[PDB]
Amino acid sequence: KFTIDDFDIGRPLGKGKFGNVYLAREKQNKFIMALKVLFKSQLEKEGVEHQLRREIEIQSHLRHPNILRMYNYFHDRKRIYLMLEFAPRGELYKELQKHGRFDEQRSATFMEELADALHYCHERKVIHRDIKPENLLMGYKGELKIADFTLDYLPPEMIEGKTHDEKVDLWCAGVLCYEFLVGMPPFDSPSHTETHRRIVNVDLKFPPFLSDGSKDLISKLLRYHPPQRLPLKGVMEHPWVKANSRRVL
Amino acid sequence: PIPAWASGNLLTQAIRQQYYKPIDVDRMYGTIDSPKLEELFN
Numbered sequence A: 001k002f003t004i005d006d007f008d009i010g011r012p013l014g015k016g017k018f019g020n021v022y023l024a025r026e027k028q029n030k031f032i033m034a035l036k037v038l039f040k041s042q043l044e045k046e047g048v049e050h051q052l053r054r055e056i057e058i059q060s061h062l063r064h065p066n067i068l069r070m071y072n073y074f075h076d077r078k079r080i081y082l083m084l085e086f087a088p089r090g091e092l093y094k095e096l097q098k099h100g101r102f103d104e105q106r107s108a109t110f111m112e113e114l115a116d117a118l119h120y121c122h123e124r125k126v127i128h129r130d131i132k133p134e135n136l137l138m139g140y141k142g143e144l145k146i147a148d149f150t151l152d153y154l155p156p157e158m159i160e161g162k163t164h165d166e167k168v169d170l171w172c173a174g175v176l177c178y179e180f181l182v183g184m185p186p187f188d189s190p191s192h193t194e195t196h197r198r199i200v201n202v203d204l205k206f207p208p209f210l211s212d213g214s215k216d217l218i219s220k221l222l223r224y225h226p227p228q229r230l231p232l233k234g235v236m237e238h239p240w241v242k243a244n245s246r247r248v249l
Numbered sequence B: 001p002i003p004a005w006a007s008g009n010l011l012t013q014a015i016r017q018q019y020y021k022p023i024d025v026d027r028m029y030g031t032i033d034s035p036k037l038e039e040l041f042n
């Protein structure tokens, strides 16, 4: 089993909900990775103890080039240490902040890698539920990485308080795609009530600069009735995705 | 202070290697669920 002494702490990568993430290098292989350091005290004082249990069992089973890898984990008196795959190009939200929005081929690539990894998860009976830029990292050549397992991103059924299946991820994928190309989420409002009314009516207002190709994919993904939302397979095969995706494999 | 292996230049060359010629992950770090059950909070 591992300890903190097995690793060379190089420098931090940024704070989070429960602790700091450090750039680390295990001395045995001299292999680089990211150490997520969580604090038991707060983990307990916020009841988030249940989820952490699941997010680990998951990555004891999940292995996908587009899902952030947890190599292992340990725990001293005060912390749980997560051995996570290093994402060299940082997080995606900041890239979206920089560029304001991504071009068609950038987003189309992200969508194929996302649809892909999501499918993999579904086969294993795993739903993500919450897919937004903040939960996405980038590889060495920029390939997308679902990292950790909000009003604007909630499907109608989630808002309305109905039971939900895997298809919430299809909805979310559409919302995500939209934000990629536009820069804002599709149902943005200055009140939680107005957003609520916009999600459930699927009040979709597409800006002038958006390609008909993209508009279509988004429209099919963002449908009220869950069983109508375009399956992951249909995403990767969508004309606009095929015509724009540029994934490294 | 920040180590040299963690400094941009020789850090970039180190990433290239783990990318293009990836070390066997689940071999070196085998036993997945090794650090016990839910007895991890005390």
Ligand SMILES: Nc1ncnc2c1ncn2[C@@H]1O[C@@H](COP(=O)(O)OP(=O)(O)NP(=O)(O)O)[C@H](O)[C@H]1O
Binding pocket: A013, A014, A015, A016, A017, A018, A019, A021, A034, A036, A068, A084, A085, A086, A087, A088, A090, A091, A134, A137, A148
């Ligand atoms: N594998 C990684 N590689 C490089 N930088 C990383 C990595 N993981 C995190 N960062 C850096 O740390 C991330 C922030 O910490 P977290 O989001 O990991 O911690 P949470 O508990 O998830 N907090 P919540 O997302 O729930 O609000 C930054 O996105 C990134 O700069």
